[PDB]
Amino acid sequence: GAKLLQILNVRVVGSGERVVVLSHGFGTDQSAWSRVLPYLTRDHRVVLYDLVCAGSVNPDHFDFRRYDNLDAYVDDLLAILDALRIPRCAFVGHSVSAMIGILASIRRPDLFAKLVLIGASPRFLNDSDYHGGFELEEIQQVFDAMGANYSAWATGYAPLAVGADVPAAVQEFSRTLFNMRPDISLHVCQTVFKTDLRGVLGMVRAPCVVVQTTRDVSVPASVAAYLKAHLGGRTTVEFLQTEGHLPHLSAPSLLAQVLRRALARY
Numbered sequence: 001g002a003k004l005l006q007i008l009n010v011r012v013v014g015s016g017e018r019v020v021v022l023s024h025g026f027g028t029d030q031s032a033w034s035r036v037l038p039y040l041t042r043d044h045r046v047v048l049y050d051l052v053c054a055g056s057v058n059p060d061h062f063d064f065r066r067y068d069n070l071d072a073y074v075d076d077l078l079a080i081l082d083a084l085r086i087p088r089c090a091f092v093g094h095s096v097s098a099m100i101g102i103l104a105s106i107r108r109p110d111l112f113a114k115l116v117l118i119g120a121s122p123r124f125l126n127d128s129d130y131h132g133g134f135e136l137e138e139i140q141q142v143f144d145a146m147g148a149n150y151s152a153w154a155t156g157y158a159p160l161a162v163g164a165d166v167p168a169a170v171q172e173f174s175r176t177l178f179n180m181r182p183d184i185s186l187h188v189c190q191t192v193f194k195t196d197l198r199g200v201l202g203m204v205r206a207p208c209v210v211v212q213t214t215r216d217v218s219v220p221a222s223v224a225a226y227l228k229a230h231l232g233g234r235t236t237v238e239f240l241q242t243e244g245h246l247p248h249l250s251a252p253s254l255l256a257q258v259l260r261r262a263l264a265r266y
């Protein structure tokens, strides 16, 4: 509870009866929301927090055993909302936080009135008749690079993830990626790559907006379609008219339009 609010840098800003949680992805912290935030705070009470793996959290809180599955990140989210006494919210999750929000919405359907998923996938690895975008041998090599030379890996990865040639966004994403402890960064990647949410998507009861960009290195277009086909609530796909995996960094004004629409009623 209380200690958790401090450890994970929880901030509540804005005001309103429509509560929105913004939950960041891999390689960033809650500062990734800074350019979308002013579009939301007149209208909504906004809860921000850092995942335990963020470089902005003291890394000695990272318990490798506890956080070897996403359910432990879910537990942290739920503990924060319970400590804040929030009974109902919308949840916006990027990347791993999209996965966390799917799981959280199944655990606590009363609490999650709507999900907005950005850069989201239920499964990165390819399977029989499922295209996730990644092969085992490919990711084995990346995980080796992450260990052998984290800094060179991160330098190469940041522009690929941003996608669009937006140097300020590359610099900003790099800043936070370099802030992650290397062993923690590898462990979150391993944990996410072993996660497969396909079977539980139909348990989601909340309406969902899947935000998809025109090219996302982590998320093939067919994954967005899979989510629309299999999530259990009323689901739509909103296509942004720019590319990248981190549109909150690279195209925040455009993303804010989608968020205002998705968060209007729930």
Ligand SMILES: Cc1c(Nc2ccccc2C(=O)O)cccc1[N+](=O)[O-]
Residues within 6 Å of the ligand: 025, 026, 094, 095, 096, 119, 139, 142, 188, 189, 192, 193, 217, 218
């Ligand atoms: C896709 C990927 C990621 N991605 C993640 C890892 C964990 C959580 C979310 C993500 C994500 O893309 O949102 C990290 C390192 C290396 C690679 N890769 O392309 O080889």
